[PDB]
Amino acid sequence: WGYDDKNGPEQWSKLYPIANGNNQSPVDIKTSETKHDTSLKPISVSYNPATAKEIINVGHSFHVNFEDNDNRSVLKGGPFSDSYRLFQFHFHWGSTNEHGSEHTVDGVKYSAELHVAHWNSAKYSSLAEAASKADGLAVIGVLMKVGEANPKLQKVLDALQAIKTKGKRAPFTNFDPSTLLPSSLDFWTYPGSLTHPPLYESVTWIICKESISVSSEQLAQFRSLLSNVEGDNAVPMQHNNRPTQPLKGRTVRASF
Ligand SMILES: NS(=O)(=O)c1ccc(SCCO)cc1
Ligand SMILES: [Zn+2]
């Protein structure tokens, strides 16, 4: 699987039939159709920068992984009664500034999107156990809007020169990714899925209503990552967002 014409989102269902399921992500959030819910608590994140571990070029994207052997870095509140442990963050982007986010809001596409993913350590004892469970994963999504350079992205962008090609990895330490979140954590939430294979319907989504910025030159750094292995002809990572998926009667809740 990939994002190209032959192996890309419109084709995933052949190998992963869940692609046509009832809880697929991402979605267009129609704000006239959201339900304000007063039982939602505020989102609380508390991440220890000592859990930052490694950055990895995975061919279609890059990931920053965290140690997840204990509850040093956690998400709580919102819709959740369980504590969720941070395991990774990453970004999705498009070929031009005009699209690239996964979630859209009233049809509006943003240039990129940040995902901060966690797993339910109250109920399960590893990512691998949690990942396919309906209550197993919690992902914060932040829409990234093209504009002024975002200096909080610095350490991440400066790391990419060490992982230019597929499979490269390097230590990435002492970093707290709550520094990337917008100053307001007002959110929407809905039950959904991983946005790429294996597409498990295991994710409770927390989508920030406030965007964070990114510059056109910062987006170019993502797009200049290479999907080929060292020594091969360069194939830039132009894009890696999945199209929005039908709600199938799900309700998006608003914390605000
Ligand atoms: N874009 S996403 O849905 O937040 C995501 C997070 C983590 C993973 S790894 C799960 C493999 O079991 C895949 C997708
Ligand atoms: Zn993602």
Give the Cα separation of 237 and 151 in Å (integer): 22
The answer for residues whose C-beta is within 8 angstroms of residue 21's C-beta and 6 or more apart is: 193, 199, 201
In the DSSP assignment, the letter for residue 120 is E
What is d(CA 51, CA 65) in angstroms, rounded to the nearest whole number?
Answer: 9
36 labelled as ligand-binding? no
Pairing, β 137-146 against β 212-214 = parallel
Give ligand 1 pocket residues (Cβ under 6 A).
115, 117, 131, 139, 194-196, 203
Q: Quick check: helix, strand or coil at residue 94?
A: coil
| Domain chopping of the chain, boundaries | 1-256
Residue 82 structure tokens = 């369980």
Tokens 């002809």 sit on residue:
233
Which residue lies with its CA nearest to atom 5 of ligand 1?
194
CATH topology of domain 1-256: Carbonic Anhydrase II (3.10.200)
How far is 58 from 42, CA to CA, in rounded Å? 33
* Dihedral angle of Cα 20, 8, 156, 55, to the nearest 10 degrees: 90
Tell which atom from ligand 1 comes closest to the C-alpha of 196.
14
Peptide bond into 17 cis (omega under 30): no
Task: Specify whether 239 is catalytic.
Answer: no
What whole-number distance in Å separates Cα of residue 113 and Cα of residue 126?
A: 26
Where are the alpha helices (H) located in the chain, listed in sequence order? 127-130, 154-159, 216-224
> What's the CA gap between 220 and 39, in Å, rounded?
41
- Residue listed under structure tokens 């230590």: 171
